[PDB]
Design a protein around this ligand. Structure first.
Ligand SMILES: CC(=O)N[C@H]1[C@H]([C@H](O)[C@H](O)CO)O[C@@](O)(C(=O)O)C[C@@H]1O
Ligand SMILES: CC(=O)N[C@H]1[C@H]([C@H](O)[C@H](O)CO)O[C@@](O)(C(=O)O)C[C@@H]1O
Ligand SMILES: CC(=O)N[C@H]1[C@H]([C@H](O)[C@H](O)CO)O[C@@](O)(C(=O)O)C[C@@H]1O
Lengths: 189, 189, 189
C-alpha cells in the first residue's frame, strides 16, 4: 500500500559501528509524486551507545535498493525489519515492488564521469538534536541516488556529522521530516 | 474528513501567558500513516504582545487529547476553535473521533518509570523566526505523547524557547512544517 | 491532477540575475488542505554561476499567479517550464486551473494599508546549503501571497540570502521541503 517502514517496534535493525547496534526508525509515505519521510536513529549497544572523545563524529546509514525498489542485503538496515506497513507491523510477503517509493533518477541522477560535481538538490542538509537537547546539534545529510555500490539502482543515505564532544552520551536524535520526488514506475508482483 | 485545524481566522484561541492572549494557527492533514502538520503562533494581547527584558523565554502550548482523539478542555488551545475543516471554517458537530490524527503510541510512547529517559524521536527540534527576521531565531520543540496530565491518552506540545533579548517586540513566528506517524485506530460517531 | 512542477529536466527556466540563467526545481503536490513543496535552485550561466566578492547576497525568485492559479509571465520562472505533471514531463494543454494549489488567502493575506506589518506565518525561514557543504548556509525565505505586482491574485516567492563570501563558487543549493495551506476553490477548464 502507501507506507514503507521499519515499524517503531521490534529489535535493533541497523549498523552504526557494528552489526545490529542501533534502531533506525524510518517511515516513507507515498503522497503522489512525492514521498513524505520521517527518520530518527538510536544506538542501543556498541561504541555509539556510550561515545568517547575518540568516537568518529560521522555515521552513514545506507539504504541501497534494486531495480524493483527492494532493499539490498548490503544495506546498513537489515531487510528483516523493512517492508510495507500492516497494523503497527509489516506485511508477511517479503519481496514487494516499491518503485513508486524510489527517488526520481532525473531529479536525483547517479553521479557520472561527465558531471564532475553532482547537483546539490540530490541532498537535504539540516540539524537534528542529540538527546533532544537544543545545544547538541547533529548535522543530518540525506542523499538520493548518490551510491553506486553493489549494483544498486537507487539509494537513500542518512549521514550524521557533528563537531561537539558528546563523549559519555548515547547517540539518540530527534525526528526529521523530509520529502523527495519519486520515480514514475509503478508495477507489482 | 482529512484535516483538523484551528482555521486561519476567528479570534484569539490560545494561552501563552493569560487566557485567549494568542492565536495558534495549526493544521493537521492526514496523509495515510503520517500527519503533515503546519504551525505558527502570534501573541495578540498580554505580556507576549510587548515583551520586556524579564519576560520568560519559554512558552509551552499543550494540546491534550482523550482516547477518541478529542481535545481536552485543560489544553492551551480552546476547544471552540478546533475541529475538522469545512469551507475555510470548521464542522458544526462538536465531538468528532480523531484517532487517525493522533501520534502513534509505539513510535511515541508515554514516558515510563522503567525508561528513565524517553526516546529522542518523540521530539522535533528546529528554529522559527520572530517577526520573520532572519537574525531572530526561536527554538521550536514539538513533542508527541510526552504529557500525562489530566488523564490524556495523547498529546502534541509546541514549546518556543529563545536566548536573545526580544524586549519591545510582539511574539509572532514564521510557519513550521512537520510530520509524525499516526495511531492505526480509525473508528467514528 | 495532483502535482504542479518545473520537471527535473529540460533547460534553464529561471532568472536569478539575467534571463534563463538558472534552473529552479520546484514540485508542488496536493495533499488535501495542504501542498507539500520541494524546491532547489542552480545557476547555470551569468553572475551566480561564478560569484565574485561584489555579487549581491540576496536573490528573489517570484512566482506570481492569476485568479485561476496560472503563472503570470512577469514571474522569474518561465511559463513554458511549469505545468501539471505527465510521465517525467508536463501536460500538453497550457492553461490549466490550479486554484487548489494556491496559498490560502485567509492564512496568508495580501499585505494591507490597515495592518502595518503582516503576520509572520506568511513566511517560512530556514537554511539550505551551497554546494551541499555543511559550512555554507544560505537562508531560504518562502513567502505566501506577499506580492501585489502585476495584478497577481496569489504569489509564492523564494528568497535566498547569505552572509559568507562564496566568491568563485557556483550558486547551487540543497533541496528544501515545506508545506502551506491551500485555497478551498477547486474549479477547472
Ligand atoms: C535549535 C538550535 O538552533 N540550537 C543551536 C543552539 C541555540 O541557538 C541556543 O541559543 C543555545 O544552544 O546553539 C548552538 O551553538 C549549540 O548549542 O550548539 C547550535 C545549535 O544548533
Ligand atoms: C536563518 C538563520 O540561520 N539565521 C541565523 C542567523 C544567520 O545565520 C545570519 O547570518 C545573521 O543573523 O544567525 C544567528 O546567529 C542570529 O542571527 O541569531 C542565528 C540565526 O538562527
Ligand atoms: C548544518 C549546519 O547547521 N551548519 C552550520 C555550521 C555547522 O554548525 C558546523 O559545526 C561547522 O560548519 O556552522 C556554520 O557556522 C557554518 O558553517 O557556516 C553555520 C552552518 O549553518
Amino acid at each position: 500500500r502507501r507506507t514503507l517502514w521499519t515499524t517503531p517496534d521490534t529489535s535493533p535493525n541497523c549498523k552504526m559501528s557494528t552489526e545490529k547496534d542501533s534502531k533506525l526508525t524510518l517511515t516513507l509515505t507515498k503522497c503522489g509524486s512525492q514521498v513524505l519521510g520521517n527518520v530518527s536513529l538510536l544506538a542501543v549497544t556498541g561504541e555509539y551507545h556510550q561515545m568517547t572523545a575518540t568516537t568518529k563524529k560521522d555515521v552513514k546509514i545506507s539504504l541501497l535498493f534494486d531495480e524493483n525498489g527492494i532493499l539490498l542485503p548490503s544495506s546498513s538496515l537489515s531487510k528483516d525489519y523493512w517492508n510495507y506497513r500492516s497494523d503497527d507491523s509489516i506485511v508477511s510477503q517479503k519481496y514487494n515492488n516499491a518503485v513508486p517509493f524510489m527517488p526520481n533518477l532525473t531529479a536525483y541522477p547517479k553521479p557520472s564521469a561527465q558531471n564532475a560535481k553532482n547537483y546539490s538538490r540530490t541532498k537535504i542538509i539540516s540539524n537534528v538534536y542529540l538527546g533532544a537537547l537544543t545545544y547538541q546539534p547533529v548535522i543530518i545529510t540525506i542523499a538520493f541516488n548518490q551510491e553506486t555500490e553493489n549494483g544498486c539502482a537507487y539509494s537513500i543515505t542518512f549521514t550524521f556529522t557533528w563537531q561537539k564532544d558528546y563523549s559519555a552520551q548515547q547517540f539518540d536524535v530527534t525526528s526529521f521530516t523530509f520529502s523527495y520526488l519519486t520515480q514514475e514506475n509503478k508495477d507489482k508482483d
